Design a protein around this ligand. Structure first.
Ligand SMILES: CCCCCCCCOCCOCCOCCOCCOCCO
Ligand SMILES: CCCCCCCCOCCOCCOCCOCCOCCO
Length: 772
């Protein structure tokens, strides 16, 4: 719809980049196609489709309208065969925006290598949850999004922390707009489990080994969250929701030009949610604020400054699971799903804030440079109190553990990179080269020396959280940890033939951790990157890649000799086929993959039975492990108003014992989410549904009172969602979401410190949304 334009005659490359910007659209073009060409002048209010063909007059170009993207091509009379994965330069470094795309499949993405590529062009497993998918299913936070993410399993540590698995491993890599955070442990990492989606366009999950842009990190995957950006037209909405257990949510989002020419633009979002829960005496208020301004210093240099803020403020938090598995005599405890072991005053409050600045420049080359500066804060205030241990006792009394943790981590990041195309042997290729630095500082106080507290409660069966609050006494411990990460990286994408694209790159990493532990250091560590994509027809490509990652170990992971273990490392080997239909409106993929891990920390049973180094007292042992499995997915348009996202993933991970490991992550899982937009008389109704299933999962847990190990199983189960929206008015809609329709009762945690957690019972959410 009608946009204000001002793009004078210049190199067609520049014009296309200016167009993408002014029109809030991604423009993809082939560098050698536009190189000796110039745009014709556009001036005024114009519909973006009229506008582009007017800009291209005289250039010989054609336009492929593809939602939030256009692609430009210059056809010849000649044409000996098509080059589907030809090197394309792009106007948006983050990819295609998903907001207003109406689709559950992404456009282009840069999660893999920093190069802006389509899913078919990326030689790794890339899954995305689109803006519209979030809107349709009411996914309001990162936990809601992970639960809906093909290939991910969400399980619970406690009421205010979940765990995300992929391919056998806990995910501990998070990016924001491609900027990696420090996530060594829960210190640096408060609130990462809890981010509200109000401020984000989409969440993009790269699965396998993602050392190339993450730097030091975990195996499994990275989760990349892309922030909402300002726009050239005014727009906003307000949203109100009410759900089971007095779950109330409001949200405001406003975006647009802040000056008459449109050279400064901003976006603001505020969101607030206050809920109780099916769990007794648990509640959580969350607040989120977001502000971003874009200044055009000149038509090819842009400055962006931005801040965000999220406070997560619960009451009735637990430390570990919702209730203890065994009672005092070893019998399994049986409790309502409402049971909550946390005390009334117990709280794991968690907060995050960022300030950030970027500068982006277009070099008359077609080359583009970017500088990203981040100040990030991850704090926590955690006076925790829960029933814990083998309780009840026969008289129905039980005992509380109570500990208080406060702290804050401050991080500063600088990321600079350069990207562009280059000719080599008569063909067009592209390259990213970049360097990064992060310094991040964790400071904290801990309190376990309670003064004159009576930690017993007379009544377990009717436990309510109504116990007293202890004198925390003085701090037990001060934390001072500093982690410093330096990286340098480069990837090149060679268009070797009309059908074959070769990916060569890597990262060199420097990682120092400093503080009250003995210093931990890796210098000059190389993380390789190799992949290829081979086109088979207009529809299908096969691909293969070899990718790597490492993480220096926590300092308590020492060995026999008191030496810190070598870093936890791994390689992902992947081969697959990806399909593309309806001009990128539908994507399919099928992959086989193996993760080889090395230096996985392992207890060291034989030493640990009788320490013999006066030196250490609980040494570990560095072992190998392997993930084997395969994965199928589909996302996009099945028929004109019919959108899906679905996946199947199978895995088994074994360690150097032979024995299966990560046995809480099911060996088999499936998601299908879908919605349909009617036409004719009912074109204002959208209907929708979804199902997630997982096979058997289990844990070995030790029953102290009976002195024996036990298997705990969660049999396979299904979960079903349903959804409907009516657009009653141009400006007003109403939705209902129903979750776990069949009220399946099941576990999200069995075995975390000998405790258990239930998943959510049937719950509804009702919302209205107002678009100005
Ligand atoms: C150093 C700290 C960095 C903080 C940056 C904070 C940014 C906050 O800016 C918010 C700007 O949002 C603009 C919201 O968009 C509304 C524009 O509409 C203009 C009024 O409409 C007139 C008629 O259309
Ligand atoms: C254990 C409890 C589970 C209960 C199961 C309930 C499932 C049945 O739900 C049926 C939903 O129909 C209710 C219709 O309400 C319409 C919602 O309209 C939204 C209001 O719009 C406001 C406009 O400003």
């Amino acid at each position: 719809q009608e946009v204000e334009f001002d793009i004078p005659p210049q190199a067609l490359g520049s014009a296309l980049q200016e167009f993408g910007r002014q029109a809030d659209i991604q423009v993809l073009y082939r560098p050698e196609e536009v190189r000796n060409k110039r745009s014709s002048a556009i001036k005024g209010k114009l519909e973006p489709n009229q506008a582009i063909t007017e800009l291209l007059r005289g250039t010989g170009a054609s336009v492929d309208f593809q939602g939030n993207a256009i692609t430009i091509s210059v056809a010849e009379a000649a044409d000996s065969s098509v080059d589907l994965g030809a090197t394309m330069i792009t106007s948006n470094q983050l990819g295609t925006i998903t907001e207003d795309s109406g689709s559950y499949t992404p456009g282009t993405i840069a999660t893999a290598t920093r190069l802006v590529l389509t899913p078919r062009e990326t030689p790794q497993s890339i899954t995305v949850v689109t803006r519209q998918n979030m809107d349709d299913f009411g996914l309001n936070n990162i936990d809601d999004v992970m639960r809906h993410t093909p290939g991910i399993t969400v399980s619970a540590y406690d009421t205010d922390r979940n765990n995300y698995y992929a391919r056998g491993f806990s995910i501990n890599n998070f990016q924001y707009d491609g900027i990696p955070s420090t996530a060594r442990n829960v210190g640096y990492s408060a609130g990462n489990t809890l981010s509200d989606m109000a401020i984000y366009d989409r969440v993009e999950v790269l699965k396998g080994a993602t050392g190339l842009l993450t730097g030091a990190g975990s195996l499994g995957a990275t989760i990349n969250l892309i922030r909402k950006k300002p726009t050239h037209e005014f727009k906003g909405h307000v949203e109100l929701g009410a759900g089971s257990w007095d779950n109330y949510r409001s949200e405001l989002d406003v975006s647009g030009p802040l000056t008459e020419s449109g050279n400064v633009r901003g976006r603001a979002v505020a969101a607030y949610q206050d809920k109780h829960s099916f769990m007794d005496h648990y509640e959580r208020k969350t607040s989120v604020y977001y502000g971003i301004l874009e200044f055009d210093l000149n038509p090819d240099t842009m400055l962006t400054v931005g801040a965000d803020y999220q406070d997560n403020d619960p009451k009735g938090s637990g430390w570990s699971g919702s209730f203890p598995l065994f009672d005092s005599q070893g019998n399994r405890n049986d409790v309502s799903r409402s049971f909550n072991n946390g005390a009334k005053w117990s709280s794991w409050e968690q907060y995050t804030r960022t300030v950030f600045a970027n500068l982006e420049h277009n070099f008359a080359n077609g080359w583009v440079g970017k500088v990203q500066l981040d100040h990030k804060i991850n704090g926590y205030h955690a006076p925790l109190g829960a029933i814990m241990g083998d309780w009840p006792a026969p008289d129905n009394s039980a005992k509380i553990v109570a500990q208080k943790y406060t702290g804050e981590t401050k991080s500063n990041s600088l990321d600079i990179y350069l990207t562009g195309p280059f000719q080599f042997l008569g063909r067009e290729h592209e390259l990213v080269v970049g360097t990064s630095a992060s310094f991040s500082h964790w400071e904290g106080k801990s309190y376990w020396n309670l003064r004159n507290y009576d930690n017993t409660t007379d009544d377990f069966i009717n436990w309510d959280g109504d116990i007293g609050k202890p004198d925390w006494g003085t701090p037990s411990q001060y934390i001072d940890d500093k982690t410093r990460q330096l990286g340098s990286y480069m990837t090149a994408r060679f268009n070797v033939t009309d059908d074959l694209n070769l990916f060569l790159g890597g990262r060199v990493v420097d990682y120092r951790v400093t503080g009250l532990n003995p210093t931990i250091r890796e210098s000059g560590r190389f993380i390789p990157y190799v992949g290829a994509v081979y086109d088979l027809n207009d529809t299908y490509s096969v691909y293969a890649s070899y990718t790597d990652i490492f993480m220096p170990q926590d300092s308590w992971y020492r060995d026999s000799s008191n030496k810190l273990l070598e870093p936890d490392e791994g390689q992902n080997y992947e081969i697959g086929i990806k399909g593309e239909y309806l001009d990128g409106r539908l994507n399919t993929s099928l992959a086989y993959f193996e993760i080889h891990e090395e230096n996985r920390a392992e207890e060291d049973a034989l030493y640990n039975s009788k320490p013999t180094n006066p030196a250490i007292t609980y040494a570990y042992k560095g072992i190998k492990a392997k993930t084997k499995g395969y994965e199928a997915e589909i996302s996009g348009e099945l028929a004109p108003g019919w959108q899906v996202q679905a996946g199947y993933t199978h895995k088994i991970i074994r360690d150097d014992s032979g024995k299966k490991v990560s046995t809480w992550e099911p060996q088999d899982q499936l998601s299908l989410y879908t919605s349909y937009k009617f036409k004719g008389a009912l074109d204002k109704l959208t209907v929708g549904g979804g199902a997630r299933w997982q096979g058997k999962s289990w844990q070995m847990v030790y029953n102290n009172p009976r002195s024996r190990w036990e298997k705990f199983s969660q049999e396979d189960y299904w979960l079903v969602d349903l959804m409907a929206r009516y657009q009653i008015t141009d400006k007003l809609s109403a939705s209902v979401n129903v979750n776990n329709v069949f009220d399946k009762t099941y576990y999200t945690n069995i075995g975390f410190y000998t405790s258990a957690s239930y998943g959510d019972p049937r719950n509804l959410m009702f919302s209205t949304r107002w678009d100005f």
